[PDB]
Symmetry: C5
Subunit: 337 residues, 5 copies
Amino acid sequence: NDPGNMSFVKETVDKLLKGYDIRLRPDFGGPPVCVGMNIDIASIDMVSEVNMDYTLTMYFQQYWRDKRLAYSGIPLNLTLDNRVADQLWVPDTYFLNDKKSFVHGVTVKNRMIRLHPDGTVLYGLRITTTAACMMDLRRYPLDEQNCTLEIESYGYTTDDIEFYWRGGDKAVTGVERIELPQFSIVEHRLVSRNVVFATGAYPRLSLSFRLKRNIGYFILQTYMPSILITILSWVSFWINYDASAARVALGITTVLTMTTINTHLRETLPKIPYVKAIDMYLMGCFVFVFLALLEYAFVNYIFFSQPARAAAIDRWSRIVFPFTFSLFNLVYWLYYV
Amino acid sequence: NDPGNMSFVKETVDKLLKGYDIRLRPDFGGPPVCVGMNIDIASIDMVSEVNMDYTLTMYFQQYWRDKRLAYSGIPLNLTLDNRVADQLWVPDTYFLNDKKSFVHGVTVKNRMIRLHPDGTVLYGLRITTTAACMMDLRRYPLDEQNCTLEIESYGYTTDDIEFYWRGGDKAVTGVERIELPQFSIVEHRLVSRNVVFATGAYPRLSLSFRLKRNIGYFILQTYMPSILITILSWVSFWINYDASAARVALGITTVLTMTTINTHLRETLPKIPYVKAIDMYLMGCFVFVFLALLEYAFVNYIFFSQPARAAAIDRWSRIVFPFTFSLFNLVYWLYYV
Amino acid sequence: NDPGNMSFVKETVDKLLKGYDIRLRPDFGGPPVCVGMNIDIASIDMVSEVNMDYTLTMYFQQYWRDKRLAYSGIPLNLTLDNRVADQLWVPDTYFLNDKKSFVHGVTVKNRMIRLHPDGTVLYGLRITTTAACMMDLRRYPLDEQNCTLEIESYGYTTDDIEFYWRGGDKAVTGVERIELPQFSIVEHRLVSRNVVFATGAYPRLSLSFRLKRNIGYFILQTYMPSILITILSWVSFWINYDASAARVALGITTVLTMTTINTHLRETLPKIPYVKAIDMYLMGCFVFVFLALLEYAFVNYIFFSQPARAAAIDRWSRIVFPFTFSLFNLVYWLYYV
Amino acid sequence: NDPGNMSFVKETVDKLLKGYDIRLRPDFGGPPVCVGMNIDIASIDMVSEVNMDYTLTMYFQQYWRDKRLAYSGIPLNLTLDNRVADQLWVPDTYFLNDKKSFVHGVTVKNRMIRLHPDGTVLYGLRITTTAACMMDLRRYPLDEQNCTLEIESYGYTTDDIEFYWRGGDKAVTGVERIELPQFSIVEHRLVSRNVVFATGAYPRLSLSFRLKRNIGYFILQTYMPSILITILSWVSFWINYDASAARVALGITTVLTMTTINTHLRETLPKIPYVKAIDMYLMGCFVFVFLALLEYAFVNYIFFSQPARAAAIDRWSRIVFPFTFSLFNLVYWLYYV
Amino acid sequence: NDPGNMSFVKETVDKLLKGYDIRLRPDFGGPPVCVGMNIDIASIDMVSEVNMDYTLTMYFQQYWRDKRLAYSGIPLNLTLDNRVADQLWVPDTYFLNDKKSFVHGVTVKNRMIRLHPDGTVLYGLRITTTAACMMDLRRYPLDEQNCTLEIESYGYTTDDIEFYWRGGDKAVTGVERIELPQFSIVEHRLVSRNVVFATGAYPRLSLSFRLKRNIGYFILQTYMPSILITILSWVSFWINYDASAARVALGITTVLTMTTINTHLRETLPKIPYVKAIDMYLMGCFVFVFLALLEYAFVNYIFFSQPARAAAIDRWSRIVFPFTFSLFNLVYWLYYV
Ligand SMILES: *[C@@H]1O[C@H](CO)[C@@H](O[C@@H]2O[C@H](CO)[C@@H](O[C@@H]3O[C@H](CO[C@H]4O[C@H](CO)[C@@H](O)[C@H](O)[C@@H]4O)[C@@H](O)[C@H](O[C@H]4O[C@H](CO)[C@@H](O)[C@H](O)[C@@H]4O)[C@@H]3O)[C@H](O)[C@H]2NC(C)=O)[C@H](O)[C@H]1NC(C)=O
Ligand SMILES: *[C@@H]1O[C@H](CO)[C@@H](O[C@@H]2O[C@H](CO)[C@@H](O[C@@H]3O[C@H](CO[C@H]4O[C@H](CO)[C@@H](O)[C@H](O)[C@@H]4O)[C@@H](O)[C@H](O[C@H]4O[C@H](CO)[C@@H](O)[C@H](O)[C@@H]4O)[C@@H]3O)[C@H](O)[C@H]2NC(C)=O)[C@H](O)[C@H]1NC(C)=O
Ligand SMILES: *[C@@H]1O[C@H](CO)[C@@H](O[C@@H]2O[C@H](CO)[C@@H](O[C@@H]3O[C@H](CO[C@H]4O[C@H](CO)[C@@H](O)[C@H](O)[C@@H]4O)[C@@H](O)[C@H](O[C@H]4O[C@H](CO)[C@@H](O)[C@H](O)[C@@H]4O)[C@@H]3O)[C@H](O)[C@H]2NC(C)=O)[C@H](O)[C@H]1NC(C)=O
Ligand SMILES: *[C@@H]1O[C@H](CO)[C@@H](O[C@@H]2O[C@H](CO)[C@@H](O[C@@H]3O[C@H](CO[C@H]4O[C@H](CO)[C@@H](O)[C@H](O)[C@@H]4O)[C@@H](O)[C@H](O[C@H]4O[C@H](CO)[C@@H](O)[C@H](O)[C@@H]4O)[C@@H]3O)[C@H](O)[C@H]2NC(C)=O)[C@H](O)[C@H]1NC(C)=O
Ligand SMILES: *[C@@H]1O[C@H](CO)[C@@H](O[C@@H]2O[C@H](CO)[C@@H](O)[C@H](O)[C@H]2NC(C)=O)[C@H](O)[C@H]1NC(C)=O
Ligand SMILES: *[C@@H]1O[C@H](CO)[C@@H](O)[C@H](O)[C@H]1NC(C)=O
Ligand SMILES: *[C@@H]1O[C@H](CO)[C@@H](O)[C@H](O)[C@H]1NC(C)=O
Ligand SMILES: *[C@@H]1O[C@H](CO)[C@@H](O)[C@H](O)[C@H]1NC(C)=O
Ligand SMILES: *[C@@H]1O[C@H](CO)[C@@H](O)[C@H](O)[C@H]1NC(C)=O
Ligand SMILES: *[C@@H]1O[C@H](CO)[C@@H](O)[C@H](O)[C@H]1NC(C)=O
Ligand SMILES: [Cl-]
Ligand SMILES: [Cl-]
Ligand SMILES: [Cl-]
Ligand SMILES: [Cl-]
Ligand SMILES: [Cl-]
């Protein structure tokens, strides 16, 4: 009779849990129970190309109705201590593609249960999850990635449990507040579908983001140092061919410098082994400095016999190398845009 | 009647827990319960730019009143074993921006419960928490950071629970004893406010520090080696231009040395990819050594035809390079102070 | 009488667990209980040569019959909450070669129990396991690996429990969907056998894959840089022998470049210490550049006394080195194919 | 009556735990309970300068008297299974400066409870703890460190619990058996005191060690390579000044070699950023090789105009550089001893 | 009467656990209980010189008799579910030198309990343990190590529990199947003894292995590259002394190459700081290349004044350096064999 009477509320709640069976879903043997889900994305911790995964922190909320929990006489929504969730049936929701997830537990287990007079249950969890994201890094670092989060029921088919995004397209919030230092989020989508398996159709909810990488860092730290070394290799062309020590030292040191750039960048670059766009550019620049030293090899071999022809080779090399390298840049960036 | 009678105290405490409901907050259905909080900061373990987080160890204390726990006849404050906290209602306090936190449990769970005759509860926890701190590292290593710790109730709105800093501005202690090897704490602030959400206003407490990085290490290990290499590149100007091997070797080795400095520092520097102030300085010095070798390319090309003009270019380069580099230093440090 | 009557189903299930003993296997003291197993491979997280292990995520399902759990009157398959599995006997199945495995527990423990009227139990678990895989890396990176997963009963012999692959060769699914960036799966096999131990025969199930490594990355990043340095060393042969500084600098810098390639690749290469095929090729190329500099040592020592003989040595070196290196390549790749 | 009668001992122990309250300390409301502590140090796992902590494994024993546990008729000390400790009051002892600690649990929880007829309790735990140790590394690697372990009661003041070292100065054993590869233990001290806090005085026990680092490794691997490069730079002085290519190459390569030593040592050196003694020596040697190349710059500029003065500068440089470097060594080692 | 009657077996087992006290050892107050132990070594995961520990996976079995568990009428050995071990007394066996150990728990806790009619208990556990192994690495990488596993009772003295190796020298199996990529096992020993402590003698079992490292990897990757650089330094002796640029560049580049070998190997070598045999060889080779460049310093200083004496120094250096280096190799390998 009195909502503020704590003794009466204890009697009301104990009546709900008297005879309550946690092993049975609501409306057992009848129509499936519809569970609505909405996510408040706290942050995206990291996106790892080496491990092919990303880490996500979110507020995961589930919304279903259990008529066994309906109470009367109290015109209020009962927010209960999170330890009562162990005494109730909850959906066996799991993330299909997650690798390691947990529920925060400081200072208490980050969980909330809110009851409603008609039997509706609001069930919230603060979850940090690492989900697998297979990344196509052929265009690295100019790549665009699409990482998803799959939500499914572990043991119940669509004859028992159905999923939907509560609130429509606005079910997932906090996407605009995500601050990824390396990526920029382009779009996010919410997909609801049933997936047919051996044991029957299973409810499925999908949340996906499209990530576009920021290339500003790689231009300054990776492409620019390699270009300048390639430019520096062409200095040998304008050096007089009689100076054997100067042009050989200049040619071989640029090759030495190029290898140091290549070898040390591999430590900073992702450890995943296969061909990438950045590797094609770095190897392309190494070929040019390799051919620049070979150019002087031909000139130095024929400088004594045919000075006019040796000088002619050197003069043309002052144009072919800048033109071919610029032509190589044109085709490379057009193919990677 | 006798405070020292252990049997009587057991009877008194068991009476308090007889009929006690942990699922209901104090004054359920009535005015919100006010929870006072104070923090004793044990230490700040680390501040990570790569992970964008910091680790904090603290004594977290909560102070509320529960009239269900009021006892009479014992004019003493009852300090109970920490296992009794599981038999009482405690606030569902959590840290909004934490990534991984735990309560120490050696040799026992680091927790204390103290009861008072009027029903007041003192609840302490020793917590190590890793909290996310988004760092703006454009001015790295001359950056100044502001890392916070957000405290909020997980399931209760301001109609049920209210937060305040117990003791005012002196609620948080131990800040002056924090010893960060890399940072110096400038100020800390305590903020109390209510944040409006979809489900209503939520109590919020904020503790923030301002961190100023120490630049002494970077001057000796990063800026000084790069400056001296740039100074060493200008030695080629005073070397006679006829010595083709000497000036070419000197010019190309400084470029080789500069790349080794750049590549190896990236391992020591933070792994976060984007433009930083230190990167601008390192790349700026590489341009100067790159142009120093290009300067001899022009001189060596025209030394035979116009010795006077080639010598004139060399003479002016002994002034422009020191002046431009000093001018570059002036604008760089003024823009980063 | 009514399948949709939740109260009747609770009575039926409680009758099954009344007097049920979890310490005794089904048909205790009689014929062994046959447990059928099928695996749905979610993914293969990683394959580590340094740790000699691979990480696997899968849906592990076990299928046995317990006549103590037979129920009548309900013509339906009872899917129960996963917390009921603690109240039933389950096989003590473990993975023989695993190093670290766990069952996912977000948002609930990833586990399902399904009962059938005849007493059959379907028991599913989502398990991430790290299994030891001893790899023969003599042919690295042209190696082919065979990693297995051994399934055995911990405490029961074949007189008590028997294993079989439920569904035959189609028991394990999802192998075709595995996407390993570095490896390609060639075949998988299912083996069932009994292994005789000291305490008797034990049931055993084996799932093995054959992995073939992708060599495309190593050709571009490891073999190609080393070959080009070896080619660049032969440039000294066509350089005139009077230029002492040029040929010595060219010869010694290629050795310097080769060491930098060798030393830095070790960081990228697996940390396991022993002889590998890639090490033989890298050391072979170092011998050629080492002998190239020794070739000029002989020429420079006898150029003054016998110019004709010194020139003859240089002329033959322009053929022997390309021929021997090509001959070395022919034998190397034939032995490693 | 019969000590060997297992049934009688069960009756005696069950009588002690009948009515026993774990929430109340012994002599509740009366004099404080004195807890004696002794530690058997198993090992010191590691000492980390990067993390500013050390790892310790020890046998932690606590010794107090509880008259509620007094028994008569059995003239024996009852060693009970470690699961009985959960049914008894134990001190809330914790380590003030620990970062991560645990109690070993294989094959059982490493814990022992021994009862005595007068009510005395012996309570042992095998604990591995990581304790914070703030290290002053200005004199690194010639530093001497003092790492402590603070022991305190979490919730009880000196009015309730008092601490003392059981056995006096011999309370802590196993210090002489500690084998640190990098450090040598000089002394250890045991301190007992009461620390006044806001809520009153708290018992405190302190165990501290003084660690002296071993410098033999750094002499061979760090100081010796840098000294020899500095010695090698002076070779240019005895080289004839007409050889422009030789002295420039020798001077610039020593600078290149010095940077490689500096950059690569940072990976092996601790990652903590600030000035250290080793950094001063490495930077000092770089200045000498930097000035050695500048010395030839002056000589090469004036060799044509004033050969006598240019030769005079070279002759004096053969003495000033060895003398200044030796003078630099004298002041450096005297200031760091 | 009927072994196959599951109801009768439940009655028999429940009778054993009726009145059973887990806090008391078998034959409490009487003769000590003898516990037999045998180990089936599954594998040795890794041996870490940096952490001074090794990881071991094994089947740990304990064999004792408890007359309280004797049953009659069932002529069979009762294999029970592993959850019954929590209802029985088990020895408090722990590993003295372990650092981190756990019992596998997928799909169940890897544990078995087998009862016998006379009261004998067979108790098995699958344990992965990391045990501390102090390694003497003065002879690294030609070192031979002896790693042990100490087994002891935590709380019981020899008056209560006694240990023995069940099966004699054949108690530990699977040693011959251990496959360490870096080490080869020479011998293993089983030791049983009582260790006298302050509180009395304690039972102790010791299992130790002798490990011999494989040096094949270090010969190819560490010793061979350093030897060839030292050989390459002697090329300067046969180069004509008039070529100042050639011999200086050759001498200083070998020093540069040697430092790169030394610095980069430290990353691959163990991080433990102190003198090792490999460090002596690497530093010895650096002295030879250091003295080789100093040899030309003397020759170049006196070539103009005394060409005959300068040539004489060069001629003798072609013999002393190969002889001293070979003499250095002879003493080094004899002292390290
Ligand atoms: C990252 O990558 C993933 C995987 O490719 C992308 O996920 C896909 O997203 C698209 C939408 O952008 C999904 O397409 C939609 O699927 C809905 C569900 O499909 C189920 O139901 C339909 C029948 O309704 C069945 O045919 C189907 O088999 C499933 O059972 C559909 O309802 C949608 O249909 C709507 O649009 C079509 C036109 O496209 C209309 O004709 C319809 O009337 C209706 O309006 C639609 O087809 C697709 O299913 C998702 N794939 C998966 C595997 O889930 C992410 O979008 C991507 N991320 C980003 C940022 O791009
Ligand atoms: C990775 O490496 C592992 C280990 O080498 C390979 O595993 C082996 O796989 C082969 C099959 O490819 C297995 O061979 C088969 O074993 C079955 C079980 O053996 C038990 O039972 C037989 C009697 O039936 C006993 O003799 C034996 O001792 C065992 O107790 C056999 O039933 C199979 O026999 C079938 O084929 C033979 C011909 O080969 C016929 O004569 C038979 O009639 C019958 O049709 C067969 O012998 C082998 O046992 C596996 N080894 C282990 C240790 O399990 C993986 O295959 C490999 N991975 C890849 C991808 O290659
Ligand atoms: C690593 O660094 C720590 C911190 O600096 C060192 O710890 C200190 O150790 C010294 C001893 O070496 C301690 O000094 C002793 O403290 C005792 C306790 O102090 C309490 O009680 C006294 C009154 O008795 C109060 O004044 C005080 O405020 C405390 O409440 C004292 O009892 C000792 O006094 C004894 O010596 C003095 C002379 O020194 C005599 O006059 C006295 O009569 C008596 O005999 C003494 O003062 C010091 O307290 C420790 N500091 C801390 C913070 O605990 C470690 O020693 C160091 N490690 C190594 C290896 O050097
Ligand atoms: C790695 O390093 C460890 C530590 O050094 C080695 O462990 C030692 O192994 C040897 C055997 O190889 C052990 O020696 C034996 O110890 C037994 C137990 O000693 C207890 O009991 C005896 C009395 O019986 C007491 O004197 C002693 O103090 C102990 O209380 C002895 O019973 C053995 O005696 C047998 O041999 C001797 C001759 O050597 C005969 O005279 C006896 O009659 C009898 O037959 C023997 O002394 C030694 O105890 C171990 N040390 C430790 C600390 O446990 C490992 O062997 C090594 N690993 C490898 C692979 O080498
Ligand atoms: C029990 O705790 C209360 C609260 O800490 C103590 O009350 C304080 O008493 C001091 C004086 O001793 C006052 O200065 C404070 O203002 C009081 N605080 C409050 C909230 O009342 C009380 O003294 C303690 N009881 C005992 C026996 O120590
Ligand atoms: C509060 O509810 C309890 C339980 O129904 C009841 O006994 C009590 O009388 C109520 N309070 C009042 C003031 O009536
Ligand atoms: C202590 O309290 C108990 C419980 O109220 C009571 O039975 C006992 O008599 C008290 N002690 C004394 C000495 O009265
Ligand atoms: C449902 O089953 C319960 C338990 O057997 C029974 O008491 C109840 O009457 C059943 N429902 C109906 C509508 O009969
Ligand atoms: C052992 O103690 C029990 C409990 O006190 C008692 O019933 C039994 O008789 C004792 N044993 C003997 C031989 O008296
Ligand atoms: C099996 O044992 C139970 C318990 O002792 C007994 O009641 C039952 O009669 C036995 N079975 C048969 C067939 O006698
Ligand atoms: Cl957490
Ligand atoms: Cl802890
Ligand atoms: Cl998980
Ligand atoms: Cl452990
Ligand atoms: Cl495990």
